[PDB]
Ligand binder design. Structure first.
Ligand SMILES: [Zn+2]
Ligand SMILES: [Zn+2]
Ligand SMILES: [Zn+2]
Ligand SMILES: [Zn+2]
Lengths: 259, 70, 48, 259, 70, 259, 70, 100
């Protein structure tokens, strides 16, 4: 015997996240606070030169949200916990192959419903224990116990994304590796340096020298006609992101579909 | 009764060697879509940088040293 | 939860801003530093 | 049993947008305000050099409308919600394939009418529950229950666009991804920098120095005989768009037509 | 009775690997236009950068080791 | 006769790590302390220019955790000790080959459970002495004594990681090699130099000179319009990592999967 | 009765020669997946930079100097 | 497994450590040392400097540059020796082969 909520079986598709907590989890829980960005910029402070106003957390959160979006496209991933209502077609060869299904959004934390319907009326709903999942790849497969295609025959409901990492330096396949946190940070810093590079001295000023009444000063900025003042930081960020992103793609791998 | 019956090797170029979990999922998809009579005539699709197939044995095998035996 | 959006500006308009004059006072203060590279002669090489 | 407006079935083509709200929805709803442009230019004020005038909000709206328009082609999309009246030809091979139809503009939020006519008279209008849609790809397919080609046989009415995203860091396939917001912003900034770059110093002046009674003032700008004043930022924006745009075409994918 | 019946692999080069949703829609279009006797003789069109087809098995198969059996 | 805990056999899968100690072991045990980072930066102090603050140890730990994480992907490894609950599919060709299994994460310090189940009920649990392991490669093979595939038939529990090295200049295959220590250190330093390089002089200032009443002070830094302040060291660290990383992949070797 | 029966050599390019332990594990995987009738028709996958197979003997062998003997 | 220390000058048995592995490890060590020492010659990040006070003036131009670090010359020469040293030593052990 065994005890479990009916949709969730400890074998195959163990429960990981309560549905209600999905709304509670936010960017701050994953470490994407503006503080982290500031830490990486330790010793550099950005202000509006015309005033004493530094940019507030609103901009940082806004940038970070679009950064985590950009990383979510950079690998074909779902990067925050999110419920999906998916309708999928009937392809015979995969159907005969234990009803193999490749979810659009991966990883799969857990599967709630998996039904076969004809006109909105459920023709047949599978037992919970029958269906089994592969979290990282998102494969959903069925193991029954005791024309060549049609559209939108089956109805799939599941939760996609990654849980925050619980233990230091480690992550489960259903768990966020720390680099996606860092990668999104580095994508955020690209925008920040694209802002901060303009404000060091006036605007568009490469070289200056000023002499008054026996005191003289000369300054030569990193600004140039060919490259912007922060271009060195951006170009180093790219060098790290490329290594970071190429290595991480090996954790997920290439995508394949039959034809 | 002994090895050497391979037809060839399918090389896929990548900057990083894919993790074994990814290769296992790759195998799962390949078996589910193409293995056996089911989905025999289908064609897979892959979006890697470059792919090669290198042949280790000829197109068709047959008995060797026939005239020697005769 | 809600998406983070820029929204509207908040800075009010100001007209006829006067300059700031450092106030004379006998009281003590503390001189705000900058920590950076220092230049020095190679006195050993000067001896040489 | 089930309750729904007759054109809309919760299974297949659930309702997403009220027809009347199509007019109401505008650029401001999606965050494409001039303030957004200014925010990315934090610390930079675009102002006439010879008079105190700043460029107004209207110019930003005009630019933004062209930024969203350029994006709508650059990835073959219809982005703002709009109602479409579409006639399509009869091709036998697709028709036998459950009446497959590829809408000219995507995504499809919802489908209102799908009828077959001969000379303007509807020969056969299908039940609502029969037809089903693929929102992102825009595939329209029919699943009936209980010469080789002709022109403009069928009639299709549908709403093309994307709704503003409801929740952070997430979007439904029928929902505007965060990247399009940033992409359209970056397109707009490419125009604004092209304008502003001329207003750095004078007109086409690279190097200057005044020497008056022993006073000396000296400036050397980013402007040069072979590089423009803002061309440092424009180049960096190209490097940014290339990463963003390529990564987003992977979300929509390549187009295909049989022959 | 076991795998290895593939004819070849259709590689499509791209800067980014297409998302699985896009590949599924690609498959839907391909099946609707070309699958089966219906639309058998038709030709698809694709506008990618470069396409290759690498053969894993010969043009025509037949029994192996026939003379050995004899 | 022989004495041992039932899961652990001295032959094949000898015990290496107590389960409880898994929690205790941390980064400090492996020498990844902030002091290590400082030691390699002997003579350099990372300090805010406008205030006397040095960056704290917490930042170093945060960086180090991301350095070890990046390494764990860059060579497909599990490096810190952790307990794994793994389900694997039944493939006939490997199963007939003494039940060959390739663990998703390696090295395998030890194996606790290896069972075959049908619907959550263990159909057959093998004797401990039967199964044998290859620690470095993670191969699990069974040596019994006196459709063609199915999903998630078997259940595997094992501990993935490496123990801290006991003796100098030597390591067992189940033991952390010294190179990973230096490699993770060098990854961390790549981040720290990226931060510190902005704090050399001012902000984006390449060349300077003050001339006051005949006094003259003049500095020209490593900072330049096309090279960053620390980019000299970063380049040298890349040249170092390339030699180190390539030489270490030869220790683990290439991955292979049948098809 | 003496050597020289090799079919060819499978070269795999790498910056460093793989350690013998790695090659032994490589052999273990190869034997478990492909050796014998079991898994005969399967195809392995390798993600190295470049692979070659150089032939040391022809496609099919047979008796030599037959007419001389006659 | 391993190697015994060399007993006799300029010689080694197959079971005996050749002196170059000693030197090779030294040169790998020096790579780290020069990667440290190169930073500390003058301040940090300073390429060129000149200072004039009260009729005495000094100018110094370091090996530091935006493109290369102060010790880069030593490191790059160490690499040139290590490559020769390592390629030659690999011929003492040879390539690895395994049947299949
Ligand atoms: Zn996949
Ligand atoms: Zn399409
Ligand atoms: Zn392996
Ligand atoms: Zn050997």
């Amino acid at each position: 015997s065994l005890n479990y909520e009916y949709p969730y079986h400890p074998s195959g598709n163990p429960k990981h996240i309560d549905v209600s907590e999905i709304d509670n989890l936010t960017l701050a829980d994953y470490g994407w606070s503006p503080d982290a960005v500031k830490a990486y910029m330790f010793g550099i402070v950005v202000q509006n030169p015309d005033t004493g106003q530094p940019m507030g957390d609103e901009f940082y959160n806004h940038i970070l949200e679009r950064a985590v979006g950009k990383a979510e496209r950079a690998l074909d991933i779902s990067i925050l916990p999110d419920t999906q209502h998916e309708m999928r077609d009937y392809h015979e060869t995969e159907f005969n192959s234990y009803m193999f299904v490749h979810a659009y959004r991966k990883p799969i934390l857990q599967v709630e419903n998996l039904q076969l319907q004809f006109n909105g009326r459920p023709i047949y709903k599978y037992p919970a224990n029958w269906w089994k999942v592969e979290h990282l790849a998102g494969h959903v497969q069925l193991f029954p116990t005791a024309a060549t295609f049609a559209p939108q025959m089956i109805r799939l409901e599941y939760v996609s994304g990654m849980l925050p990492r619980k233990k230091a330096g480690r992550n489960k396949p259903w768990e966020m590796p720390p680099e996606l946190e860092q990668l999104v940070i580095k994508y955020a810093l690209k925008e920040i340096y694209q802002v901060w590079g303009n404000l060091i001295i006036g605007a568009g000023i490469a070289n200056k020298t000023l002499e008054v009444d026996g005191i003289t000063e000369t300054i030569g900025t990193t600004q140039s006609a060919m490259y912007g003042g922060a271009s060195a930081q951006i170009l180093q960020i790219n060098e790290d992101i490329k290594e970071l992103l190429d290595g991480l793609r090996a954790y997920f791998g290439y995508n394949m579909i039959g034809l | 009764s002994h090895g050497g019956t391979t037809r060839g090797i399918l090389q896929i170029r990548s900057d990083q060697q894919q993790s074994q979990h990814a290769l296992e999922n790759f195998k799962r998809e390949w078996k589910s879509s193409l293995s056996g009579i089911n989905g025999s005539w289908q064609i897979p699709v892959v979006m890697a940088d470059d792919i090669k197939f290198v042949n280790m044995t000829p197109t068709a095998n047959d008995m060797q040293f026939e005239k020697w035996l005769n | 939860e809600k998406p983070y959006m820029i929204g509207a500006n908040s800075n009010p308009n100001v007209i006829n801003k006067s300059t700031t004059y450092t106030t004379t006072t006998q009281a003590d203060e503390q001189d705000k530093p900058k920590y950076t590279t220092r230049l020095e002669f190679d006195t050993i090489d000067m001896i040489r």
